[PDB]
């Protein structure tokens, strides 16, 4: 086996930065590299095989370089289409090695998330337990405080987050936080809030409601 | 169009063997290579094996001796992949891709063509079904003329779930969410969708559940929230 070591394992960069990224072959493999794409729940995706020959369809931005042991990609001008994992490829030989990946993280402006809350639907409660859903949606950046309020008492160890990858166009961000407790707890209140903090709100947003309206 | 269709997830017991379909369709599976690549989430790529269906010769990577086999039925155009006395840590994303017919020995092992994957889970774990419980739209999902509505897709095992919105009609402002992983071991998931509020009314919204390891399907219609 020829070990790949890329680097950096993760950068973040604008729409229309020039980005490189470089992968190291721990032996000489001549031209015998290829670069692909990965976007999130997709297969990795040619880009350039030959160290620096242009699969097919692939944009005149993507461009590649090197020989033996050091080799460069370079996106001209990022677009929001290419955030995802960059993976170098050695096929010199056996086991025809993957690197470890570069995350590409695309920076935008700053953008506010709109806030929508969901009681729990009849039919769960039905069963015995009250999931309430708290959605984030198309924010940018990433960090965000969620607090959930059970009659104006803070909430702690009874939620769970979950966050999108970066939208493919706009590269924000959406977020769900669920509250889970049993009906008989549920039943218990009346007013269910979820309190959001983001750099894009002026003042912290509050979504709420009273249990039956 | 050139494509690679793979079977459905699958979950296994530790001992036991998975064996993973890739049909080639749009070109014809014996002019080229097929390869297996399998992917564990927060790890790069590991090649497996190749396989020429019109020689029935094959080359296995050192690291899988003796555990994988690949096979062939060119009369149905499929490629199989067969991975045996699983472990806990076989569970990945297995993918299908191809590469040219390589004279001996010329080099271009790259993949130009990829299956979409399919997850194996080896686990112990009893195999559950989720439940489907709607996310309905009411005013107190609205932001100026945007409704969000959903669905809530809980207490299931193994990964994963897909869902779709009105059989794959609708895909815009669809944001289906990575699972969590509960206390109770299950996952849950949400899938939510923005659309007009002008639309709630007019519109039908179902959102399509498929968990293959449970042979679950579910259709869920999301509809205005019961006051
Ligand atoms: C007709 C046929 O089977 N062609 C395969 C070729 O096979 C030759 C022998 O004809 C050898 O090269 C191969 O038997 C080496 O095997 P291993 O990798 O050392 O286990 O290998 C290439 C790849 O080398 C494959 O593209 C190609 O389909
Ligand atoms: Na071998
Ligand atoms: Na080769």
């Known amino acids: 086996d020829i070990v790949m070591t890329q680097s950096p394992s993760i950068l973040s960069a604008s729409v229309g930065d020039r980005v490189t990224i470089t992968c190291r072959a721990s032996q000489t493999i001549s031209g015998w590299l290829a670069w692909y794409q990965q976007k999130p729940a997709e297969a990795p995706k040619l880009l350039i095989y030959?160290?620096?020959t242009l699969e097919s369809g692939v944009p005149s931005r993507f461009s590649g370089s090197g020989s033996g042991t050091e080799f460069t990609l370079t996106i001209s001008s990022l677009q929001p289409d290419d955030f995802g994992i960059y993976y170098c490829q050695q096929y010199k030989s056996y086991s025809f090695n993957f690197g470890q990946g570069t995350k590409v993280e695309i920076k935008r402006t700053v953008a506010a998330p709109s806030v929508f809350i969901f009681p729990p639907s009849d039919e769960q409660l039905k069963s015995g337990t009250a999931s309430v859903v708290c959605l984030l949606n198309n924010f940018y950046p990433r960090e965000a405080k969620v607090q959930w309020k059970v009659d104006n008492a803070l909430q702690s160890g009874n939620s769970q987050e979950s966050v999108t990858e970066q939208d493919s166009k706009d590269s924000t961000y959406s977020l769900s936080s669920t509250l889970t407790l049993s009906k008989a707890d549920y039943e218990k209140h009346k007013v269910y809030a979820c309190e959001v903090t983001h750099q894009g709100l002026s003042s912290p947003v509050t979504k709420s409601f009273n249990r039956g309206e | 169009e050139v494509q690679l269709v793979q079977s459905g997830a699958e979950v296994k017991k530790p001992g036991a063997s998975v064996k993973v379909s890739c049909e080639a369709s749009?070109?014809?599976?014996?002019?080229?290579?097929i390869n297996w690549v399998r992917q564990a989430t927060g790890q790069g790529p590991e090649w497996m094996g190749w396989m020429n269906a019109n020689s029935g010769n094959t080359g296995y990577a050192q690291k899988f001796q003796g555990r994988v086999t690949l096979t062939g039925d060119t009369s149905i155009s499929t490629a199989y992949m067969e991975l045996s006395s699983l472990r806990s840590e076989d569970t990945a994303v297995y993918y299908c891709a191809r590469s040219s017919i390589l004279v001996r020995g010329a080099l271009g092992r790259y993949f130009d063509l990829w299956g979409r994957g399919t997850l194996v889970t080896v686990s112990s774990a009893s195999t559950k079904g989720p439940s489907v419980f709607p996310l309905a739209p009411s005013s107190k999902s609205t932001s100026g003329g945007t409704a969000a509505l959903g669905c809530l897709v809980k207490d299931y095992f193994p990964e994963p779930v897909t869902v779709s919105w009105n059989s794959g009609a609708l895909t815009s402002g669809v944001h289906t969410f990575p699972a969590v992983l509960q206390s109770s071991g299950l996952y849950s998931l949400s899938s939510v969708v923005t659309v007009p509020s002008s639309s709630l009314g007019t519109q039908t919204y179902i959102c399509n559940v498929n968990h293959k390891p449970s042979n679950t399907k579910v259709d869920k219609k999301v509809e205005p929230k019961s006051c």
């Open positions: 030959k160290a620096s």
């Open positions: 749009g070109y014809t599976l014996t002019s080229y290579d």
